[PDB]
Design a protein around this ligand. Structure first.
Ligand SMILES: Nc1ncnc2c1ncn2[C@@H]1O[C@H](COP(=O)(O)OC(=O)[C@@H]2CCCN2)[C@@H](O)[C@H]1O
Ligand code: PRO
Lengths: 476, 478
């Protein structure tokens, strides 16, 4: 059972919820967490979805080794096998760019060779984490990373936006998490690329923005450095236009924070490992096949409508124990079946998100459960989307910044997009924060969806002519 | 390009050519690690889908455990990669990279299991693993490799053993039904079995061109040994505490290598239809603007018609390559069926289809295309299998005395011989056989076949002369 309340003490809530939900398990090496099936199934579902969509695009999967040689630094060295030292120390690769892009320079010779489109599902190691937290700040995480090379900038840009739409769909259609499409500022884009696009999400309980996924128009700078050249149709050598795009198990974290409540998790039915848990009202020793037999008939029929079902027939636990257990785990539907239910030909179903109860005839069960699951998924999304809209304040001047930040809100303000002004704003907001102790605010994205910018509008900080509406807040 | 090394002459060079020219492997600066390019990865994805669905049917759930292991947990040796520094700082405690995940998972198993109601526990992992050996071979013997490792705990040994055998049967289907590679089920000897466990079962495969057996996959009865090491106990109904019974089982990208070596020919890969991501490649023949737009249309129509039958079809309508280039390209790549449509063919109501395995061509009506391609694909799959099974049968010699060993070994053959199963006898046989190999050459136990020939009374061990316990399959090996 979850004791900490989600809005009073969020961090404690988060920890309690993900452990009592049987999502992760601890490990004797810091910053590392075992992903148990109740979370890994969610990864499996968003992975299958995204993989199907990028395969429609012509992206194909690959595997690159996890090691890199000396010809490459703050990196992890493997120096022995058994007790023997290696001839040359090898490193666990920092990035994938370093291994893939020489390979790309080999494989690309002519315009016939483009576009080249590769994706990799793997795990990533990061060595410097501050305070570890499952799915958010961890030593190892899972992701997918894709890397494309195209003959022209416009094709590459088109692909960047197509992938970004797939990330919108990952978060919104699968995990029911609303996100905002935008372009990163110069001070927050990938170091070597032309443009970074992003989907952003909001955590109301701490008012923090978090980056859901990135899609970079890398341009030619990497092709210049790595000598990825192709000869065009008229015989000249040209640099390829690259993109790269990535999404991680952080998405699981964003889903938890989005839909959980004081009772624990709420997993959207599209990714829940069990959509419907069947709980026999049995106490202690009451073993007759009457209840468990009807429970099995019901599981069979629900499964043939492609519903993911579990019967929790564990003898040594009370029905109320089981209710709380599966509520903390976040199953969207619970099917109570007891002697009175059996003696009426119905079942009682409870929704996890609202707690509403329904008495349903056994014949009606499969259609009504499909309907209720669609309703739960849409409800989760719509309420999160109203919360997101409610968390963004449209300001005009800098005096409105610190009020909004203290309402745990984001701000949308006209900005001149000058890079030094962003660092000044972060400095200023963090110092204002510090003195309020009696922290910093940064750009999240420049949204694709731009309100009108009246002629002559001034930037909310510098005073200079504002160019675009930018979204700011405190951030993960 | 095209393969020019011949398979029955220089096998090493043939293999390298086949896997490079088909765009399956790219070579890499670090010995023993290789880049797996999409064309290989498609096959790996087919077999992973197969196996994942089947183990899901058994109630096994996927999970992800960390890739690093602590020194203590690992040592509760010579092949384990150690991270010892970050930058130039030595780490306070060195940590290992995963060579296998028993010591990563079983502390968690010990925490998660309390009553007989927690059992069976059935978890599986798709991931990569590092073991630092010998001389490397792409797919076959690599230092980092992709695999699945499954781990289960049960209340009884008989239930564990049942699962061991079911998973081994799944590996037989992986190789034989999916990759059209025959394999022999058996037990490892006591000296060849998984360290710490009770009984290791295995499927074994054979490479005729060098006479070498190879371990395709393994299914372990870990028994209760690890349960003691990690304190994995449960309360039964009587209330008594009992150690669980554990299985461990895994299989890797080595299967791809075996498939290649089994089915390839002097032209390159031959991919069995069941794991071919492209089963039929449609080549539109365009020359002198003859009916260029019309034929492309009929190609798209045929694609649609065939997809309605779940045939995996690709149209190579790339304008920047000639048709002859396209033929060579899709044959090195091993696509089982090639469908040529030119204006001659649009005139008739037919298409020309060539099988990759034999080269035989067929003129097929459009209305007949779906059923006849389904039939040819099932035929190609079966012929790949049957030809390789014949070669496996003729690669094994049944002997009775040690004098027959070195002749058989030099005919590039395996030996099935009556053995007493004494552990020292296996190391003795290894050393004797390598010494005589000279006059990497050693013969070891591949497996004790499940399918045992009859053992006449008084049959002597082929090496010690003591009574023979069972028939054993010996060979030179990978
Ligand atoms: N260097 C290599 N390259 C490619 N494939 C390889 C290599 N070495 C072995 N294999 C392949 O991987 C498997 C490793 O199994 P196992 O005996 O080490 O057992 C276990 O570890 C148990 C079961 C899983 C969890 N624990 C072998 O069957 C072989 O096909
Ligand atoms: O770190 C990132 O954001 C990029 C995404 C693709 C691979 N690396």
């Amino acid at each position: 059972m979850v004791t900490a309340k989600k809005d009073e003490n969020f961090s404690e809530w988060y920890t309690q919820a993900i452990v009592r939900s049987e999502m992760i398990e601890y490990y004797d090496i810091s910053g590392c967490y075992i992903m148990r099936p109740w979370a890994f199934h969610i990864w499996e579902k968003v992975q299958r979805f995204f993989d199907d969509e990028i395969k429609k695009m012509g992206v194909e999967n690959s595997y690159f080794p996890m090691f890199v040689s000396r010809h490459k630094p703050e990196v992890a060295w493997v120096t022995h096998y058994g007790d023997s030292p290696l001839p040359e120390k090898i490193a666990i690769r920092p990035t994938s760019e370093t291994i893939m892009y020489p390979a790309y320079a080999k494989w690309i010779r002519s315009h016939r060779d483009l576009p080249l489109k590769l994706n990799q599902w793997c795990s990533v190691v990061r060595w410097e984490f501050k305070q570890p937290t499952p799915f958010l700040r961890t030593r190892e995480f899972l992701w997918q990373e894709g890397h494309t090379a195209h003959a022209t900038e416009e094709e590459a840009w088109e692909l960047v936006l197509d992938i970004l739409e797939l990330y919108r769909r990952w978060y919104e259609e699968c995990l029911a998490v609303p996100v905002i499409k935008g372009e990163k500022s110069e001070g927050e884009k990938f170091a070597g690329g032309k443009k970074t696009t992003t989907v952003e999400a909001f955590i109301p309980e701490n008012g923090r923005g978090i980056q859901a996924a990135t899609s970079h128009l890398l341009g030619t700078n990497f092709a210049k450095m790595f000598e990825i050249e192709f000869e065009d149709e008229e015989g000249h050598k040209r640099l390829v236009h690259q993109t790269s795009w990535g999404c991680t198990t952080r998405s699981l974290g964003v889903m938890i924070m989005t839909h959980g409540d004081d009772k624990g998790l709420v997993i959207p039915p599209r990714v829940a490992s069990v959509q419907v848990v069947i709980i026999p009202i049995l106490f202690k020793d009451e073993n007759t096949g009457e209840i468990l037999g009807k429970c099995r008939e019901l599981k069979t029929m629900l499964e043939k409508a492609d519903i993911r079902v579990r019967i929790d027939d564990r003898s040594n636990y009370t029905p109320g124990w089981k209710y709380n257990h599966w509520e903390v785990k976040g199953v969207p539907l619970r099917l109570e079946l007891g002697p009175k239910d059996l003696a009426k030909g119905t079942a009682r179903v409870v929704r996890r998100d609202t707690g509403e109860a329904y008495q349903i005839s056994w014949a009606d069960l499969a259609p009504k459960l499909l309907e209720l699951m669609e309703g739960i998924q849409r409800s989760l999304f719509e309420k999160a989307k109203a919360r997101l809209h409610e968390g963004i304040e449209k300001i005009s001047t800098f005096d409105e910044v610190m009020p909004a930040l203290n309402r745990k809100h984001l701000v949308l303000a006209p900005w001149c997009e000058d890079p030094e002004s962003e660092e000044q704003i972060k400095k200023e907001t963090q110092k204002l924060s510090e003195i309020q102790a009696i922290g910093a605010m940064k750009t999240l994205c420049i949204p694709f969806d731009q309100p009108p910018m009246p002629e002559g509008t001034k930037c909310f900080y510098t005073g200079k002519p504002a160019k675009r509406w930018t979204l700011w807040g405190r951030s993960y």
